[PDB]
Amino acid sequence: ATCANGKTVGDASCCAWFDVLDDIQANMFHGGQCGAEAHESIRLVFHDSIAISPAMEAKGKFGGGGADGSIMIFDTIETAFHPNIGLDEVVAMQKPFVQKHGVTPGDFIAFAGAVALSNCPGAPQMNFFTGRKPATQPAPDGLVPEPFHTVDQIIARVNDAGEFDELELVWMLSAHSVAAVNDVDPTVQGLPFDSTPGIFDSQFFVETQFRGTLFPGSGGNQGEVESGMAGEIRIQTDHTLARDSRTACEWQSFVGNQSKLVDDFQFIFLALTQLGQDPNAMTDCSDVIPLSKPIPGNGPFSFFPPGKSHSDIEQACAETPFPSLVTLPGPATSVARIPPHKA
Ligand code: HEM
Ligand SMILES: *[C@@H]1O[C@H](CO)[C@@H](O[C@@H]2O[C@H](CO)[C@@H](O)[C@H](O)[C@H]2NC(C)=O)[C@H](O)[C@H]1NC(C)=O
Ligand SMILES: *[C@H]1O[C@H](CO)[C@H](O)[C@H](O)[C@H]1NC(C)=O
Ligand SMILES: *[C@H]1O[C@H](CO)[C@@H](O)[C@H](O)[C@@H]1O
Ligand SMILES: [Ca+2]
Ligand SMILES: [Ca+2]
Secondary structure, eight states: OBBBBBBBBBSSSHHHHHHHHHHHHHHTTTOOOOOHHHHHHHHHHHHHOOOOOOHHTTSSSOOOOSSHHHHHHHHHHHTTTTTGHHHHHHHHHHHHHHHHHTTHHHHHHHHHHHHHHHHHOOOOOOOOOEOOOOOOOOOOSSOOOOSSOOOHHHHHHHHHOOOOOOHHHHHHHHGGGOEEESSSSTTTTTTESOTTSSOOHHHHHHHHHHHOOOOOSSSOOEEEEEETTTTOEEHHHHHHHSSTTTTTTHHTTTTTHHOOOOOHHHHHHHHTTTTTSOOSSSSGGGSSSSSOOOOOOSOOOOOOOOOGGGGGGGOOOSOOOOOOOOOOEEEESOOEEEOOOOO
């Protein structure tokens, strides 16, 4: 099919998404950046999608519709749940675009998350399928994991939601490679999870493996543990998954392995966006998503940031020792915070 703009797509129903693309690149993502709005959009995909529970349905209670736009249509209820803190502002940013373009809220969430990733150097070539009907009812609470939950709880939660295994759990946490934390430390907003919040890479997997030695801002915050880098925050779940015998080797496998990181995340991201949907009833509009950019420069894919070395690593994968990475030259640098979207 040839859209009105002269671009060709596999299915003419996808043509309308070029107007949504042009709008959000200029008006939500500040010209196509991998900044606060792109990070916020990627997070929203998970909080919309994971709120599905066959276990609850079996106890005869509504367990949530998965990737249905519920968090947007029923934001007064959903964004008030503790795991969803800060998403009221993300929904407020996105909602007018849905109304303006006449697309479903669930499809817009999925679209914005795929476009947000496409702006981050190193991201996989993201898929985009349409067809999510408007949510029937708000999801219940207790479905989105907290940074203070145990590994057992988190595994149980994703097993229930989508029959995802503990390896896939590690894969979807790759999104913490392009992310910051606004609400865990009450004294500062925008502490990144890795030293490259603008780059989809494995620095998250490297940096969470360092021994925790400081708090980047304040201490005594629920869900927060020490990190090994000034300016970088670490949450308890990421810390414990990197060290748990069930997931440690999987965590470490992404270090220096860009193809595994990209292929697994492409897969798991699509899976999230299809929770509560029938893939067979959806239309593939993946050809609307911009081609992903390569990581600039020609340094190594993975490295130890300046001032860190292999001896800072807390080895947890019993079967494979942590790879020998180069240390970038120079003195230690504080990871710059990423100011949240200015409402
Ligand atoms: C065990 C599962 C997870 C837990 C406990 C967790 C926890 C957190 C917390 C505590 C924050 C900061 C939120 C705030 O301060 O408002 C956050 C940020 C974020 N998370 Fe997760 N998360 C998990 C899984 C995921 C997954 C699977 C995705 C994939 C989409 C994702 C993507 C994001 C992104 C991109 C951000 C940054 C948001 C921004 O920069 O504003 N998270 N996560
Ligand atoms: C990145 O991880 C991928 C997937 O594990 C690795 O690809 C496999 O390498 C193993 C062992 O060398 C083989 O038995 C498999 O056939 C390969 N492919 C897949 C898709 O499973 C690859 O070794 C890793 N690349 C680096 C640079 O470590
Ligand atoms: C440790 O990880 C490496 C991946 O580079 C090897 O595949 C090795 O077999 C792994 N062992 C375990 C325990 O999974
Ligand atoms: C170290 O310093 C940077 C400013 O250079 C901050 O952005 C960071 O939060 C940390 O305090
Ligand atoms: Ca939902
Ligand atoms: Ca990164």
